Amino acid sequence: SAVQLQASGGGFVQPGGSLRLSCAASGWAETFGHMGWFRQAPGKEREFVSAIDWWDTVHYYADSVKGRFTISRDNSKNTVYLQMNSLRAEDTATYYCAYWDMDYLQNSIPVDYWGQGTQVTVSS
Amino acid sequence: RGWIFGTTLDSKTQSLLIVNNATNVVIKVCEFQFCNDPFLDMESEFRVYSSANNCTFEYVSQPFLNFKNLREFVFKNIDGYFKI
Amino acid sequence: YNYLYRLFRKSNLKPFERDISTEIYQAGNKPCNGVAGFNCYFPLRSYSFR
Ligand SMILES: *[C@@H]1O[C@H](CO)[C@@H](O)[C@H](O)[C@H]1NC(C)=O
């Protein structure tokens, strides 16, 4: 399997604002592996943020971010999008675009590839 | 005193230090940076490395001690093993 | 995922050799400058055990 992931978006915003992130996948893989986003803070570990499938059928968001983050899949350009709204200070960290190559995601544990770190800072 | 062997003489993974002093021999494989002119200066002050990263060997033993001295060495390396 | 294995290297190893360099692999003419991307992959992969 050879998957290349590209991450777009990020930057400096204010609390309560809105933003759009995106990841694009290229190459070949075993199957229609799902796509997700993780978030790592300086001095802490990576945290599961969002997960979506390859056909927009299963949505999975972390409990601490339930009903707030949104993830969608495009229809004609293969690029997954992550819509972000009403940011707070705890959202200032580096997001990563994670790929897992299997049909059904029982858990987010099996990771085969990562993505370029996108810095998202939320401050006054 | 010594012979700082190694590879591309940068971070890499190889900065063999074979420094010898009046106390003992301090054979040491650790990888580090070594400024730009390692010189040593009672002369018991050695200033070679700046930050040893990881380490993978140690050794201590007795030192190697007109003109009234002449020393020879044949440094060789076969299949990893180093012969002095 | 604490077990890792190197995937890309410019040249083969001599017998009983150890490599721990983590520099970004170069697969094309353009330098990677320590950044992943096209022709710029991390030399070591991970091991999936289930
Ligand atoms: C030595 O190697 C490890 C990985 O094997 C590296 O992460 C580390 O930075 C190196 N040693 C130190 C403590 O700098």
Side-chain angles (χ1 to χ4, degrees), chain A, chain B residues 1-13 15-84, chain C:
Chain A
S1 87
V3 201
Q4 299 222 248
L5 300 179
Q6 195 30 262
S8 147
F12 289 73
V13 294
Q14 259 90 46
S18 277
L19 215 56
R20 208 179 184 92
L21 310 180
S22 79
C23 196
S26 35
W28 78 272
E30 201 295 335
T31 166
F32 324 120
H34 322 154
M35 181 36 48
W37 282 64
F38 269 69
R39 194 220 50 51
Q40 196 173 359
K44 299 304 293 285
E45 250 177 15
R46 215 156 270 168
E47 154 190 2
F48 159 30
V49 187
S50 166
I52 205 178
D53 73 290
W54 211 240
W55 318 86
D56 183 351
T57 68
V58 194
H59 266 207
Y60 184 14
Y61 307 94
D63 158 37
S64 86
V65 300
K66 268 215 71 72
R68 265 158 290 119
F69 284 131
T70 49
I71 182 143
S72 38
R73 191 190 188 290
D74 202 76
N75 238 349
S76 60
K77 50 154 191 41
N78 191 86
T79 281
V80 73
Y81 269 99
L82 183 70
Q83 316 72 62
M84 206 165 27
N85 48 3
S86 208
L87 278 309
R88 320 72 177 164
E90 67 94 18
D91 292 310
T92 294
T94 313
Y95 288 77
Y96 294 85
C97 164
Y99 174 68
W100 330 278
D101 203 4
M102 100 308 299
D103 288 338
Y104 168 70
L105 195 77
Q106 229 152 326
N107 312 107
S108 40
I109 66 156
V111 54
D112 313 278
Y113 305 97
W114 294 99
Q116 301 83 55
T118 282
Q119 178 54 43
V120 171
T121 297
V122 191
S123 70
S124 45
Chain B
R1 300 291 235 245
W3 302 270
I4 167 157
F5 305 99
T7 326
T8 88
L9 258 60
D10 167 339
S11 152
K12 212 39 191 60
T13 178
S15 199
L16 257 153
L17 199 73
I18 325 287
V19 55
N20 159 46
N21 74 337
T23 73
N24 45 66
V25 197
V26 167
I27 301 109
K28 162 150 42 56
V29 155
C30 313
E31 147 222 10
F32 28 65
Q33 325 301 145
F34 26 69
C35 34
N36 30 247
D37 43 279
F39 75 114
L40 291 49
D41 322 312
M42 202 46 257
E43 313 307 314
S44 306
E45 162 218 1
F46 84 110
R47 279 219 186 88
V48 172
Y49 45 67
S50 79
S51 44
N53 278 337
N54 31 65
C55 281
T56 2
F57 222 87
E58 289 296 322
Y59 196 107
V60 195
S61 149
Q62 155 97 42
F64 298 141
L65 214 163
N66 220 19
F67 222 105
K68 307 296 168 42
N69 259 315
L70 165 77
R71 310 175 155 78
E72 273 97 317
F73 300 100
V74 177
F75 307 141
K76 195 154 74 91
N77 45 317
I78 291 332
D79 285 355
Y81 287 115
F82 207 65
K83 288 107 148 165
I84 297 185
Chain C
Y1 275 129
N2 329 96
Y3 295 165
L4 300 185
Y5 80 114
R6 161 171 319 266
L7 185 54
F8 280 83
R9 202 172 188 283
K10 318 160 299 311
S11 94
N12 275 8
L13 299 181
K14 298 189 168 82
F16 278 53
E17 273 298 353
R18 148 153 68 260
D19 195 346
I20 71 175
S21 85
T22 81
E23 317 254 6
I24 301 288
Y25 180 79
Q26 158 155 281
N29 330 298
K30 317 144 282 304
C32 297
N33 328 292
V35 197
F38 193 26
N39 303 71
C40 296
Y41 331 108
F42 220 68
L44 50 87
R45 285 301 211 276
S46 197
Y47 262 148
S48 68
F49 289 139
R50 208 65 39 80

